[PDB]
mmCIF file of C-alpha atoms in Angstrom:
data_model
loop_
_atom_site.group_PDB
_atom_site.id
_atom_site.type_symbol
_atom_site.label_atom_id
_atom_site.label_comp_id
_atom_site.label_asym_id
_atom_site.label_seq_id
_atom_site.Cartn_x
_atom_site.Cartn_y
_atom_site.Cartn_z
ATOM 1 C CA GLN A 541 -16.065 -12.329 22.263
ATOM 2 C CA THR A 542 -13.927 -13.659 19.388
ATOM 3 C CA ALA A 543 -11.486 -10.986 18.231
ATOM 4 C CA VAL A 544 -9.559 -10.777 14.944
ATOM 5 C CA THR A 545 -6.523 -8.608 15.612
ATOM 6 C CA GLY A 546 -4.846 -6.523 12.930
ATOM 7 C CA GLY A 547 -3.448 -3.207 11.888
ATOM 8 C CA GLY A 548 -0.693 -1.700 9.783
ATOM 9 C CA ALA A 549 -0.917 0.536 6.723
ATOM 10 C CA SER A 550 -2.540 3.918 7.229
ATOM 11 C CA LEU A 551 -3.395 4.365 3.533
ATOM 12 C CA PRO A 552 -6.511 2.076 3.537
ATOM 13 C CA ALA A 553 -7.281 2.367 7.238
ATOM 14 C CA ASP A 554 -10.571 4.286 6.928
ATOM 15 C CA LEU A 555 -11.858 1.969 4.225
ATOM 16 C CA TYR A 556 -11.194 -0.850 6.690
ATOM 17 C CA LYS A 557 -12.484 0.595 9.983
ATOM 18 C CA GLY A 558 -14.263 3.569 11.490
ATOM 19 C CA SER A 559 -16.406 4.892 8.627
ATOM 20 C CA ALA A 560 -20.079 4.124 8.061
ATOM 21 C CA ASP A 561 -19.139 2.172 4.907
ATOM 22 C CA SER A 562 -16.013 0.484 6.301
ATOM 23 C CA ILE A 563 -15.499 -3.082 5.152
ATOM 24 C CA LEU A 564 -13.868 -5.051 7.949
ATOM 25 C CA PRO A 565 -16.252 -6.860 10.301
ATOM 26 C CA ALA A 566 -16.976 -5.304 13.678
ATOM 27 C CA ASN A 567 -14.808 -7.844 15.530
ATOM 28 C CA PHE A 568 -11.713 -7.064 13.433
ATOM 29 C CA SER A 569 -9.464 -4.473 15.041
ATOM 30 C CA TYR A 570 -7.111 -2.278 13.003
ATOM 31 C CA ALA A 571 -4.314 -0.388 14.770
ATOM 32 C CA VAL A 572 -2.762 2.200 12.436
ATOM 33 C CA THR A 573 1.043 1.969 12.504
ATOM 34 C CA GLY A 574 2.278 2.154 8.946
ATOM 35 C CA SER A 575 2.998 -0.873 6.794
ATOM 36 C CA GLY A 576 6.468 -1.723 8.120
ATOM 37 C CA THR A 577 5.268 -2.079 11.691
ATOM 38 C CA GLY A 578 2.211 -3.964 10.461
ATOM 39 C CA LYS A 579 4.339 -6.528 8.630
ATOM 40 C CA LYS A 580 6.544 -6.940 11.700
ATOM 41 C CA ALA A 581 3.544 -7.399 13.990
ATOM 42 C CA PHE A 582 2.248 -10.230 11.800
ATOM 43 C CA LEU A 583 5.557 -11.841 10.864
ATOM 44 C CA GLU A 584 6.819 -11.973 14.461
ATOM 45 C CA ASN A 585 3.318 -12.416 15.935
ATOM 46 C CA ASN A 586 3.756 -9.394 18.209
ATOM 47 C CA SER A 587 0.517 -7.671 19.181
ATOM 48 C CA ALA A 588 2.331 -5.130 21.371
ATOM 49 C CA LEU A 589 2.997 -3.255 18.110
ATOM 50 C CA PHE A 590 -0.788 -2.923 17.726
ATOM 51 C CA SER A 591 -1.158 -1.735 21.348
ATOM 52 C CA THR A 592 -2.987 -4.925 22.304
ATOM 53 C CA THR A 593 -2.460 -8.542 23.392
ATOM 54 C CA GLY A 594 -2.790 -12.071 22.046
ATOM 55 C CA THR A 595 -2.127 -13.366 18.556
ATOM 56 C CA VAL A 596 -1.834 -11.014 15.582
ATOM 57 C CA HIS A 597 -4.208 -12.405 12.957
ATOM 58 C CA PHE A 598 -3.593 -10.084 10.000
ATOM 59 C CA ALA A 599 -1.971 -6.928 8.743
ATOM 60 C CA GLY A 600 -2.644 -4.333 6.088
ATOM 61 C CA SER A 601 0.431 -3.334 4.110
ATOM 62 C CA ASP A 602 1.181 -1.374 0.950
ATOM 63 C CA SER A 603 4.802 -2.570 1.305
ATOM 64 C CA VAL A 604 5.269 -5.970 -0.343
ATOM 65 C CA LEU A 605 6.703 -8.864 1.616
ATOM 66 C CA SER A 606 10.397 -9.091 0.831
ATOM 67 C CA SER A 607 12.320 -12.234 -0.063
ATOM 68 C CA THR A 608 14.096 -12.025 3.301
ATOM 69 C CA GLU A 609 10.820 -11.603 5.208
ATOM 70 C CA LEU A 610 9.346 -14.648 3.483
ATOM 71 C CA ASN A 611 12.401 -16.841 4.043
ATOM 72 C CA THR A 612 12.678 -15.862 7.715
ATOM 73 C CA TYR A 613 8.955 -16.528 8.173
ATOM 74 C CA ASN A 614 9.106 -19.926 6.468
ATOM 75 C CA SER A 615 12.161 -21.043 8.433
ATOM 76 C CA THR A 616 10.619 -19.948 11.770
ATOM 77 C CA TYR A 617 6.892 -20.622 11.503
ATOM 78 C CA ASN A 618 6.465 -23.076 8.584
ATOM 79 C CA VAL A 619 9.152 -25.695 9.218
ATOM 80 C CA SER A 620 8.701 -29.037 7.472
ATOM 81 C CA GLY A 621 7.576 -31.684 9.931
ATOM 82 C CA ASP A 622 7.140 -29.261 12.840
ATOM 83 C CA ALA A 623 4.009 -30.053 14.850
ATOM 84 C CA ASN A 624 4.182 -26.530 16.328
ATOM 85 C CA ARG A 625 4.273 -24.731 12.970
ATOM 86 C CA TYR A 626 1.839 -21.954 12.115
ATOM 87 C CA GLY A 627 1.688 -22.977 8.456
ATOM 88 C CA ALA A 628 1.879 -20.822 5.369
ATOM 89 C CA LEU A 629 1.026 -17.150 5.230
ATOM 90 C CA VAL A 630 -1.273 -15.500 2.679
ATOM 91 C CA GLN A 631 -0.480 -12.218 0.924
ATOM 92 C CA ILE A 632 -3.248 -10.822 -1.291
ATOM 93 C CA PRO A 633 -4.031 -7.473 -2.917
ATOM 94 C CA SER A 634 -6.990 -5.683 -1.350
ATOM 95 C CA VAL A 635 -7.548 -2.600 -3.536
ATOM 96 C CA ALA A 636 -5.411 -0.546 -5.890
ATOM 97 C CA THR A 637 -4.483 3.043 -5.090
ATOM 98 C CA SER A 638 -2.752 6.085 -6.453
ATOM 99 C CA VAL A 639 -0.207 8.104 -4.506
ATOM 100 C CA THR A 640 -1.087 11.803 -4.513
ATOM 101 C CA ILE A 641 1.172 14.859 -4.293
ATOM 102 C CA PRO A 642 -0.457 17.435 -1.980
ATOM 103 C CA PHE A 643 1.240 20.792 -1.735
ATOM 104 C CA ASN A 644 0.689 24.075 0.090
ATOM 105 C CA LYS A 645 1.530 27.034 -2.154
ATOM 106 C CA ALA A 646 -1.113 29.465 -3.390
ATOM 107 C CA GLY A 647 -1.595 30.039 -7.095
ATOM 108 C CA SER A 648 -2.767 28.478 -10.338
ATOM 109 C CA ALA A 649 -3.198 24.807 -11.197
ATOM 110 C CA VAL A 650 0.000 22.742 -10.960
ATOM 111 C CA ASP A 651 0.885 19.982 -13.441
ATOM 112 C CA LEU A 652 4.295 18.382 -12.806
ATOM 113 C CA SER A 653 6.313 16.543 -15.412
ATOM 114 C CA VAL A 654 8.222 13.395 -14.500
ATOM 115 C CA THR A 655 11.399 15.482 -14.531
ATOM 116 C CA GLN A 656 9.878 17.959 -12.070
ATOM 117 C CA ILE A 657 8.505 15.362 -9.641
ATOM 118 C CA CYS A 658 11.849 13.557 -9.693
ATOM 119 C CA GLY A 659 13.570 16.865 -8.992
ATOM 120 C CA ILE A 660 11.347 17.755 -6.037
ATOM 121 C CA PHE A 661 11.608 14.401 -4.266
ATOM 122 C CA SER A 662 15.381 14.132 -4.831
ATOM 123 C CA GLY A 663 16.141 17.651 -3.560
ATOM 124 C CA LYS A 664 17.340 18.935 -6.957
ATOM 125 C CA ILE A 665 14.374 21.323 -7.170
ATOM 126 C CA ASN A 666 14.241 23.047 -3.800
ATOM 127 C CA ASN A 667 12.586 26.416 -4.542
ATOM 128 C CA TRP A 668 9.204 27.059 -6.160
ATOM 129 C CA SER A 669 10.789 29.548 -8.559
ATOM 130 C CA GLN A 670 12.675 26.638 -10.173
ATOM 131 C CA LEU A 671 9.313 25.291 -11.460
ATOM 132 C CA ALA A 672 8.699 27.234 -14.669
ATOM 133 C CA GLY A 673 5.380 28.998 -15.147
ATOM 134 C CA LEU A 674 3.857 28.169 -11.754
ATOM 135 C CA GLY A 675 3.904 31.785 -10.561
ATOM 136 C CA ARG A 676 5.386 30.747 -7.213
ATOM 137 C CA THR A 677 8.544 31.530 -5.280
ATOM 138 C CA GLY A 678 10.117 30.416 -2.012
ATOM 139 C CA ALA A 679 11.656 27.363 -0.399
ATOM 140 C CA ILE A 680 10.172 23.930 -1.022
ATOM 141 C CA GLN A 681 10.091 21.781 2.105
ATOM 142 C CA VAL A 682 9.308 18.110 1.448
ATOM 143 C CA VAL A 683 7.409 16.244 4.171
ATOM 144 C CA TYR A 684 8.127 12.507 4.258
ATOM 145 C CA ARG A 685 7.140 9.529 6.416
ATOM 146 C CA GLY A 686 9.711 8.810 9.113
ATOM 147 C CA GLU A 687 8.411 5.273 9.702
ATOM 148 C CA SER A 688 8.513 2.363 7.263
ATOM 149 C CA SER A 689 5.631 3.086 4.914
ATOM 150 C CA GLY A 690 3.905 1.422 1.989
ATOM 151 C CA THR A 691 3.081 4.835 0.570
ATOM 152 C CA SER A 692 6.828 5.551 0.546
ATOM 153 C CA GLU A 693 7.432 2.225 -1.208
ATOM 154 C CA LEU A 694 4.818 2.932 -3.886
ATOM 155 C CA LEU A 695 6.162 6.428 -4.538
ATOM 156 C CA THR A 696 9.812 5.404 -4.616
ATOM 157 C CA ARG A 697 9.108 2.447 -6.890
ATOM 158 C CA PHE A 698 7.616 4.889 -9.406
ATOM 159 C CA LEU A 699 10.528 7.308 -9.029
ATOM 160 C CA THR A 700 13.050 4.462 -9.410
ATOM 161 C CA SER A 701 11.324 3.259 -12.575
ATOM 162 C CA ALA A 702 10.559 6.606 -14.231
ATOM 163 C CA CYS A 703 13.322 9.047 -13.304
ATOM 164 C CA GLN A 704 16.293 9.426 -15.674
ATOM 165 C CA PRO A 705 19.851 10.229 -14.519
ATOM 166 C CA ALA A 706 19.522 13.834 -15.727
ATOM 167 C CA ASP A 707 16.375 14.269 -13.604
ATOM 168 C CA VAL A 708 18.209 13.616 -10.313
ATOM 169 C CA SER A 709 21.781 14.668 -11.022
ATOM 170 C CA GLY A 710 23.432 16.830 -8.406
ATOM 171 C CA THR A 711 21.528 15.275 -5.501
ATOM 172 C CA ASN A 712 22.294 13.172 -2.454
ATOM 173 C CA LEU A 713 20.492 10.072 -3.751
ATOM 174 C CA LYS A 714 22.526 6.900 -3.369
ATOM 175 C CA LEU A 715 24.432 5.936 -6.499
ATOM 176 C CA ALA A 716 23.462 3.389 -9.135
ATOM 177 C CA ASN A 717 25.567 2.966 -12.290
ATOM 178 C CA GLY A 718 27.826 5.735 -10.979
ATOM 179 C CA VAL A 719 25.157 8.450 -10.637
ATOM 180 C CA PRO A 720 22.506 9.481 -8.085
ATOM 181 C CA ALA A 721 19.402 7.364 -8.541
ATOM 182 C CA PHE A 722 16.139 6.648 -6.805
ATOM 183 C CA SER A 723 15.781 3.189 -5.278
ATOM 184 C CA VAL A 724 12.790 1.384 -3.781
ATOM 185 C CA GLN A 725 12.512 2.272 -0.091
ATOM 186 C CA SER A 726 9.786 1.860 2.498
ATOM 187 C CA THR A 727 11.913 4.089 4.754
ATOM 188 C CA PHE A 728 12.056 7.179 2.534
ATOM 189 C CA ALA A 729 15.104 8.683 4.273
ATOM 190 C CA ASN A 730 17.138 5.643 3.180
ATOM 191 C CA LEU A 731 17.097 7.024 -0.378
ATOM 192 C CA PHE A 732 19.893 9.431 0.544
ATOM 193 C CA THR A 733 23.510 9.428 1.626
ATOM 194 C CA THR A 734 22.481 12.389 3.811
ATOM 195 C CA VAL A 735 18.886 13.635 3.860
ATOM 196 C CA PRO A 736 18.749 17.201 2.452
ATOM 197 C CA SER A 737 17.924 19.856 4.998
ATOM 198 C CA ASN A 738 14.680 20.861 3.234
ATOM 199 C CA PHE A 739 13.192 17.413 3.965
ATOM 200 C CA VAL A 740 11.276 17.000 7.223
ATOM 201 C CA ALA A 741 9.690 13.924 8.750
ATOM 202 C CA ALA A 742 5.996 14.175 9.501
ATOM 203 C CA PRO A 743 5.347 14.858 13.209
ATOM 204 C CA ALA A 744 3.247 11.755 13.864
ATOM 205 C CA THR A 745 2.621 8.315 12.421
ATOM 206 C CA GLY A 746 0.464 7.935 9.359
ATOM 207 C CA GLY A 747 -0.370 9.664 6.119
ATOM 208 C CA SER A 748 -3.117 11.862 7.552
ATOM 209 C CA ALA A 749 -0.588 13.464 9.918
ATOM 210 C CA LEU A 750 1.756 13.981 6.949
ATOM 211 C CA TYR A 751 -1.105 15.615 5.043
ATOM 212 C CA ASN A 752 -1.854 18.045 7.867
ATOM 213 C CA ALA A 753 1.863 18.824 8.189
ATOM 214 C CA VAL A 754 1.962 19.853 4.504
ATOM 215 C CA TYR A 755 -0.685 22.508 5.209
ATOM 216 C CA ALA A 756 0.932 23.699 8.458
ATOM 217 C CA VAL A 757 3.757 25.640 6.744
ATOM 218 C CA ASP A 758 3.748 27.548 3.457
ATOM 219 C CA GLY A 759 5.653 25.957 0.592
ATOM 220 C CA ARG A 760 5.487 22.310 1.642
ATOM 221 C CA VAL A 761 4.981 19.303 -0.625
ATOM 222 C CA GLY A 762 4.267 15.731 0.457
ATOM 223 C CA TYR A 763 2.916 12.380 -0.681
ATOM 224 C CA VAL A 764 -0.158 10.561 0.587
ATOM 225 C CA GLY A 765 -2.810 8.087 -0.406
ATOM 226 C CA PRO A 766 -5.955 9.564 -1.942
ATOM 227 C CA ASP A 767 -8.608 8.816 0.691
ATOM 228 C CA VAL A 768 -7.600 11.715 3.015
ATOM 229 C CA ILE A 769 -7.418 14.250 0.183
ATOM 230 C CA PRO A 770 -10.491 16.496 0.333
ATOM 231 C CA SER A 771 -10.460 17.006 -3.457
ATOM 232 C CA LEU A 772 -8.305 15.020 -5.912
ATOM 233 C CA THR A 773 -9.241 17.430 -8.704
ATOM 234 C CA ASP A 774 -8.100 20.711 -7.156
ATOM 235 C CA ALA A 775 -4.757 21.137 -8.904
ATOM 236 C CA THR A 776 -4.080 24.294 -6.890
ATOM 237 C CA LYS A 777 -3.548 21.912 -3.936
ATOM 238 C CA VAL A 778 -2.934 18.396 -5.361
ATOM 239 C CA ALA A 779 -0.537 18.252 -8.284
ATOM 240 C CA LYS A 780 -1.334 16.669 -11.589
ATOM 241 C CA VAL A 781 1.463 14.401 -12.840
ATOM 242 C CA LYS A 782 2.055 14.006 -16.576
ATOM 243 C CA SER A 783 -1.239 15.932 -17.135
ATOM 244 C CA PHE A 784 -3.292 13.525 -14.967
ATOM 245 C CA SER A 785 -5.026 14.012 -11.655
ATOM 246 C CA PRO A 786 -4.632 11.108 -9.200
ATOM 247 C CA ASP A 787 -8.142 9.792 -10.022
ATOM 248 C CA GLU A 788 -6.996 9.084 -13.615
ATOM 249 C CA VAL A 789 -5.024 5.857 -13.151
ATOM 250 C CA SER A 790 -5.386 3.603 -16.202
ATOM 251 C CA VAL A 791 -6.715 0.250 -15.013
ATOM 252 C CA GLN A 792 -5.806 -1.152 -18.436
ATOM 253 C CA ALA A 793 -2.160 -0.072 -18.110
ATOM 254 C CA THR A 794 -1.850 -1.218 -14.474
ATOM 255 C CA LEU A 795 -4.145 -3.859 -12.947
ATOM 256 C CA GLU A 796 -5.042 -5.561 -16.229
ATOM 257 C CA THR A 797 -1.392 -6.098 -17.234
ATOM 258 C CA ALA A 798 -0.919 -8.990 -14.770
ATOM 259 C CA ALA A 799 -3.101 -12.033 -14.307
ATOM 260 C CA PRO A 800 -3.389 -13.920 -11.022
ATOM 261 C CA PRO A 801 -0.798 -16.647 -10.437
ATOM 262 C CA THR A 802 -1.565 -20.364 -10.678
ATOM 263 C CA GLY A 803 0.082 -23.569 -9.510
ATOM 264 C CA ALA A 804 3.429 -23.145 -7.788
ATOM 265 C CA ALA A 805 3.295 -19.462 -8.716
ATOM 266 C CA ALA A 806 0.193 -19.173 -6.510
ATOM 267 C CA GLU A 807 1.973 -20.938 -3.627
ATOM 268 C CA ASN A 808 4.575 -18.155 -3.592
ATOM 269 C CA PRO A 809 3.059 -15.183 -1.686
ATOM 270 C CA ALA A 810 5.270 -12.724 -3.585
ATOM 271 C CA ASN A 811 3.424 -13.477 -6.828
ATOM 272 C CA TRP A 812 0.089 -12.233 -5.483
ATOM 273 C CA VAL A 813 1.240 -8.589 -5.481
ATOM 274 C CA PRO A 814 2.263 -7.320 -8.910
ATOM 275 C CA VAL A 815 3.951 -3.940 -9.022
ATOM 276 C CA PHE A 816 3.588 -1.279 -11.766
ATOM 277 C CA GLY A 817 6.402 1.230 -11.388
ATOM 278 C CA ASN A 818 6.067 2.916 -14.808
ATOM 279 C CA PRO A 819 2.594 2.592 -16.364
ATOM 280 C CA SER A 820 2.310 3.106 -20.118
ATOM 281 C CA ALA A 821 -0.754 5.375 -19.761
ATOM 282 C CA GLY A 822 -2.617 7.395 -17.146
ATOM 283 C CA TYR A 823 -1.672 8.779 -13.762
ATOM 284 C CA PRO A 824 1.631 6.989 -13.182
ATOM 285 C CA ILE A 825 1.989 6.574 -9.382
ATOM 286 C CA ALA A 826 -0.101 3.571 -8.356
ATOM 287 C CA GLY A 827 -0.055 0.090 -6.903
ATOM 288 C CA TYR A 828 -1.765 -2.402 -4.652
ATOM 289 C CA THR A 829 -2.392 -2.227 -0.951
ATOM 290 C CA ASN A 830 -2.526 -5.724 0.498
ATOM 291 C CA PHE A 831 -3.505 -8.011 3.326
ATOM 292 C CA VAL A 832 -1.303 -10.517 5.088
ATOM 293 C CA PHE A 833 -3.219 -13.355 6.788
ATOM 294 C CA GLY A 834 -2.280 -16.756 8.092
ATOM 295 C CA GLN A 835 -3.468 -19.716 6.091
ATOM 296 C CA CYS A 836 -4.090 -21.562 9.350
ATOM 297 C CA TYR A 837 -5.610 -20.493 12.682
ATOM 298 C CA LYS A 838 -5.934 -22.696 15.745
ATOM 299 C CA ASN A 839 -8.988 -20.582 16.610
ATOM 300 C CA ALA A 840 -11.527 -21.998 14.158
ATOM 301 C CA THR A 841 -13.858 -19.002 14.504
ATOM 302 C CA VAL A 842 -11.035 -16.641 13.549
ATOM 303 C CA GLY A 843 -10.443 -18.805 10.489
ATOM 304 C CA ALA A 844 -14.146 -18.786 9.622
ATOM 305 C CA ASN A 845 -14.343 -15.014 10.120
ATOM 306 C CA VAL A 846 -11.370 -14.505 7.796
ATOM 307 C CA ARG A 847 -12.928 -16.767 5.143
ATOM 308 C CA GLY A 848 -16.221 -14.921 5.462
ATOM 309 C CA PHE A 849 -14.545 -11.568 4.970
ATOM 310 C CA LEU A 850 -12.636 -12.893 1.952
ATOM 311 C CA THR A 851 -15.834 -14.290 0.436
ATOM 312 C CA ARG A 852 -17.400 -10.806 0.548
ATOM 313 C CA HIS A 853 -14.397 -8.638 -0.365
ATOM 314 C CA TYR A 854 -13.365 -10.952 -3.239
ATOM 315 C CA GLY A 855 -16.920 -11.873 -4.201
ATOM 316 C CA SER A 856 -18.688 -11.247 -7.460
ATOM 317 C CA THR A 857 -22.108 -9.730 -8.008
ATOM 318 C CA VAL A 858 -23.954 -8.321 -11.006
ATOM 319 C CA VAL A 859 -25.620 -4.982 -10.285
ATOM 320 C CA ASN A 860 -27.436 -3.040 -13.003
ATOM 321 C CA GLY A 861 -26.039 -5.594 -15.445
ATOM 322 C CA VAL A 862 -22.415 -4.844 -14.484
ATOM 323 C CA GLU A 863 -20.201 -7.292 -12.607
ATOM 324 C CA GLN A 864 -18.441 -5.918 -9.535
ATOM 325 C CA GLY A 865 -17.102 -6.922 -6.181
ATOM 326 C CA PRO A 866 -19.578 -6.584 -3.290
ATOM 327 C CA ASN A 867 -17.470 -3.882 -1.627
ATOM 328 C CA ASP A 868 -16.736 -1.894 -4.785
ATOM 329 C CA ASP A 869 -19.022 1.053 -3.897
ATOM 330 C CA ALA A 870 -17.204 1.538 -0.582
ATOM 331 C CA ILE A 871 -13.836 1.072 -2.294
ATOM 332 C CA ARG A 872 -14.647 3.831 -4.793
ATOM 333 C CA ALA A 873 -16.113 6.074 -2.081
ATOM 334 C CA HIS A 874 -12.713 5.890 -0.359
ATOM 335 C CA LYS A 875 -11.040 6.992 -3.614
ATOM 336 C CA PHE A 876 -9.529 3.567 -4.328
ATOM 337 C CA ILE A 877 -9.616 1.273 -7.361
ATOM 338 C CA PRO A 878 -11.439 -2.087 -7.150
ATOM 339 C CA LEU A 879 -9.659 -5.285 -8.081
ATOM 340 C CA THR A 880 -10.498 -6.806 -11.422
ATOM 341 C CA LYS A 881 -12.823 -9.778 -11.699
ATOM 342 C CA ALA A 882 -9.997 -12.195 -12.528
ATOM 343 C CA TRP A 883 -8.166 -11.311 -9.324
ATOM 344 C CA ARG A 884 -11.264 -11.445 -7.121
ATOM 345 C CA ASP A 885 -12.193 -14.834 -8.588
ATOM 346 C CA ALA A 886 -8.662 -16.171 -8.069
ATOM 347 C CA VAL A 887 -8.453 -15.038 -4.437
ATOM 348 C CA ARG A 888 -11.934 -16.323 -3.655
ATOM 349 C CA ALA A 889 -11.316 -19.714 -5.265
ATOM 350 C CA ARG A 890 -7.977 -20.358 -3.565
ATOM 351 C CA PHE A 891 -8.149 -18.660 -0.175
ATOM 352 C CA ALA A 892 -11.846 -18.258 0.685
ATOM 353 C CA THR A 893 -13.198 -21.646 -0.468
ATOM 354 C CA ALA A 894 -12.575 -24.029 2.423
ATOM 355 C CA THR A 895 -12.327 -27.165 0.253
ATOM 356 C CA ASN A 896 -9.281 -25.763 -1.594
ATOM 357 C CA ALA A 897 -5.924 -27.001 -0.238
ATOM 358 C CA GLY A 898 -4.709 -23.388 -0.243
ATOM 359 C CA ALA A 899 -7.663 -21.975 1.679
ATOM 360 C CA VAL A 900 -7.783 -20.435 5.133
ATOM 361 C CA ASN A 901 -8.342 -23.315 7.565
ATOM 362 C CA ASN A 902 -8.631 -25.893 4.812
ATOM 363 C CA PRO A 903 -9.104 -29.053 6.923
ATOM 364 C CA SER A 904 -6.388 -31.086 5.191
ATOM 365 C CA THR A 905 -3.631 -28.481 5.021
ATOM 366 C CA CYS A 906 -4.364 -26.844 8.380
ATOM 367 C CA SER A 907 -5.089 -30.010 10.357
ATOM 368 C CA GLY A 908 -3.620 -29.650 13.844
ATOM 369 C CA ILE A 909 -1.622 -26.487 13.054
ATOM 370 C CA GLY A 910 -2.000 -22.727 12.904
ATOM 371 C CA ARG A 911 -1.445 -19.359 14.503
ATOM 372 C CA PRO A 912 -1.975 -19.747 18.264
ATOM 373 C CA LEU A 913 -5.110 -19.271 20.279
#
């Protein structure tokens, strides 16, 4: 009977549950809501947001925990001396992912420069004829996620980092340094003083509904994680960016540029999710999608089930002479990027190994405390 209740981000949802190769155990549930609702469900321990009851045990999110979220959590659920505290939370990367740019406009292969992508998503470029050489004409309608979304956060972090003032001049983006500028937003509409009229919210929650909305009306463009894309390589339907298809992220220029935190750095959940807004090589729109767990569970079987999952997902095996995580074949089959060995080792050592003071249901740290039965 023991249930492990979660949900959140749509981007990794099919890797996690519902496919023949999905990686969460059978007793883990995963209600797809988008990352913002997932974080709220965990942080406020509110399973109604996952259409169920009881304690929320985890969330998936491709939106990082904010400073305010962490401080509110600590001061509510991890109070010094409080016998009723839940304890610390755990934020860890799960896989890395690109963000893809599906579009619905017949013609030749499309390769967008940084300037052009910035122009489309700011509203500056609003007609296909304004994209030189693409052989296309007509209004561009941009489909975006109405709910708080990790995919939105990943895309807007890239746009904030890469777009120059001249790329977004003459738009409704909120000002920075006196000029329109992208900012990091999990609620995409919050980029703007007023949303331009050629931007439309997807008609249902989740990236797959956004994807289908792109193909419902000629001339649309959107943004979505790669798993739902039927073909990442068909540049007549999924744009290249800077000459790269979305399966050409440079692991060297992204994941390998940050090592796992240690010591007090490892006690701070924010340090477990590096961000790479402007990679020096390769397909440039990429980041981590993450889990949020409790460190401590009053239900010992939930704690054991979480540790067991972590031991597999962050494990290490040598297959055909090549080291990999145990789930890496499924990760790649879902069009995602496995974590590097250093990160898997660090997560496994700290969070999955019960004798470690930082581990899920470590007897010393978690003694008498935890998320409720």
